[PDB]
Design an enzyme around this catalytic site. Structure first.
Site, PDB file in Angstrom:
ATOM      1  N   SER A  17       2.442  -5.259 -11.965  1.00  0.00           N
ATOM      2  CA  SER A  17       3.209  -6.056 -13.500  1.00  0.00           C
ATOM      3  C   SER A  17       3.029  -5.610 -14.666  1.00  0.00           C
ATOM      4  O   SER A  17       3.266  -5.917 -15.697  1.00  0.00           O
ATOM      5  CB  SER A  17       3.891  -7.763 -13.280  1.00  0.00           C
ATOM      6  N   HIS A  50      -0.871  -8.797 -17.807  1.00  0.00           N
ATOM      7  CA  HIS A  50       0.557  -8.925 -18.274  1.00  0.00           C
ATOM      8  C   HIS A  50       0.317  -8.356 -20.158  1.00  0.00           C
ATOM      9  O   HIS A  50       1.115  -7.833 -20.327  1.00  0.00           O
ATOM     10  CB  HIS A  50       1.618 -10.429 -18.620  1.00  0.00           C
TER      11      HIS A  50
END
Lengths: 177, 5
Positions: free
Chosen positions: A109, A159
């Site tokens: 991610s 992130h």
């Protein structure tokens, strides 16, 4: 279709399979970001952290995002573009996650956050590229970052570093266009 | 360990 889109989904599934047979920790020892300076020359680790997933919802959630957005970059801007985004974002989101919280993290991610960043900005500054991120998704993306700040147990540095990388590259690429 | 997510 997309060769670089499928190769990564197969890698992630192959490595997930091994984590089920050998256990998470056993794979982690070999694929994680180096935990000891002595291991710094084990080059694969700077990238391999990105293939490791910790639940089925973890891999499925990630591979879905990878398919939607990765497939779109590859389709419109080519295999070479998706390779370069992947390698740079995986390395740098790794580097920032390691400083924030140490080397025990994994998942795709970080690459995904850079893809969200690239597809959104590129679609605003160079609409003609033929990729874009819908408003409904730039909201889910932003809720996703902040829901990691206030906790699950996400890799928050991955992130934010990924997002940043993908904005930067989309900006650079929306000059050269 | 922290998930990338």
């Amino acid at each position: 279709a997309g060769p670089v889109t499928w190769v990564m989904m197969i890698a992630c599934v192959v490595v997930f399979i091994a984590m089920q047979i050998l256990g998470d920790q056993e794979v982690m020892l070999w694929l994680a970001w180096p935990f000891d300076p002595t291991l710094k020359f084990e080059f694969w680790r700077y990238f391999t952290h990105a293939l490791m997933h910790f639940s089925l919802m973890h891999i499925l959630f990630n591979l879905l995002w990878w398919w939607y957005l990765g497939g779109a970059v590859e389709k419109r801007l080519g295999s070479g573009k998706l390779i370069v985004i992947t390698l740079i974002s995986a390395l740098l989101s790794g580097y920032v996650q390691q400083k924030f919280s140490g080397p025990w993290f994994g998942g795709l991610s970080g690459v995904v956050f850079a893809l969200m960043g690239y597809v959104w900005l590129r679609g605003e500054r160079d609409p003609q590229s033929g990729i874009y991120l819908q408003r409904g998704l730039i909201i889910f993306a932003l809720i996703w970052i902040v829901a990691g700040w206030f906790d699950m147990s996400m890799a928050n540095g991955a992130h934010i570093a990924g997002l940043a990388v993908g904005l930067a590259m989309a900006f650079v690429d929306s000059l050269n266009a | 360990v922290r998930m990338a997510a």
